[PDB]
Amino acid sequence: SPVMVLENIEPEIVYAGTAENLLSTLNRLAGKQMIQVVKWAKVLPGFKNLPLEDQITLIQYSWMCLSSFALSWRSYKHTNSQFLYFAPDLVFNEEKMHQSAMYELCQGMHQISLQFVRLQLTFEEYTIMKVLLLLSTIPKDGLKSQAAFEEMRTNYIKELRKMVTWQRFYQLTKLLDSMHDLVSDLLEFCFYTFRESHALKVEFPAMLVEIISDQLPKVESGNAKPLYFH
C-alpha cells in the first residue's frame, strides 16, 4: 500500500526569487522548500502516527539530507544531471558554483545527481529512499517512541527491497550512506555561515534560524547519531 500513497503525496515546485547574494538567496529558497517538506511528511504512512514531538525532531535532523537529495532528483529530472537545478529561476552552472564560494559542496551534490542518472533511478526508488533519509538521523539516546520508530523504519527498508528485487539494493543504500558524508560537510559550512552571518552578510529566513538554532549545539556535540546501512 505505501508505494502508492507515497507517490500521491509528492510536492510540486518552489521558486528562489556574489557569494553573499547567492548564499542568502539559497537560504531563502530553503526556508520556503521546508514548508513543502513538512506537508509531504505530515501525510507519510507510519510516520504521521508518531507523537508530534518525534516528527519535529526527525525533520530538523534531516532537513539538509532531504534538501540535498531532492535537489539531485530535480537536477536529474530537469537537466539530465548536467546542472544543479535548485529552482526554475536558479539553476547552477559550473560558474555559479565557484561564484557561490561553495564549489566543492556543489560538486558533491552534483556527483549524487550523476549517480541517479548512472543508476537510472526511478521515482519509486526515490520516494522510498527519501523516506529513509527522513528516518536516518536520530538523537544519540533515541526518541520517545523508539520501538515504533524502528519497526516502521525497518519496514520501509524491506519495502525498498521488494522494490528493487541485490546489487541494486546495495547500490541504493550505499548512496544513502554517502548522503550522510556530504550532509556533514554542508552542515559545517551552514553552521559557519550561520554563526558568522553578520560578518559574512549571509541571511537566514526565520524557519531556518529556528531549525539551525537547535541543530548545531547538539550536532557539534555528537548527539545527532547518523544511521548507516553498511
Ligand X SMILES: C[C@]12CC[C@H]3[C@@H](CCC4=CC(=O)CC[C@@]43C)[C@@H]1CC[C@@H]2C(=O)CO
For binding to ligand X (CB under 6 A), which residues are involved? 23, 26-27, 29-30, 33, 67-68, 71, 86, 102, 105, 186, 189-190, 193, 202
Minimum CB separation of residue 221 from ligand X in Å reads 19
CB neighbourhood size of 165 (10 A): 8
Q: How far apart are CA 79 and CA 63, in angstroms?
A: 24
Backbone φ and ψ of 223, nearest 5°: -80, -25
Q: Is 8 labelled as part of a ligand binding site? A: no
Minimum CB separation of residue 165 from ligand X in Å reads 31
Minimum CB separation of residue 53 from ligand X in Å reads 24
Q: Is 27 labelled as part of a ligand binding site? A: yes
Encoded amino acid at 104, one letter:
E
Owner of C-alpha cell 521546508 = 34
Minimum CB separation of residue 97 from ligand X in Å reads 12
Q: Is 74 labelled as part of a ligand binding site? A: yes
Contact between residue 169 and residue 225 where contact means Cβ atoms under 8 Å apart: no
Q: Is 120 labelled as part of a ligand binding site? A: no
110-to-59, 90, 209 alpha-carbon distances in Å: 23, 15, 26
Q: Can you say which residues are annotated as belonging to the binding site for 21-hydroxyprogesterone?
A: 27, 33, 74, 193
Q: Can you say which residues are annotated as belonging to the binding site?
A: 27, 33, 74, 193
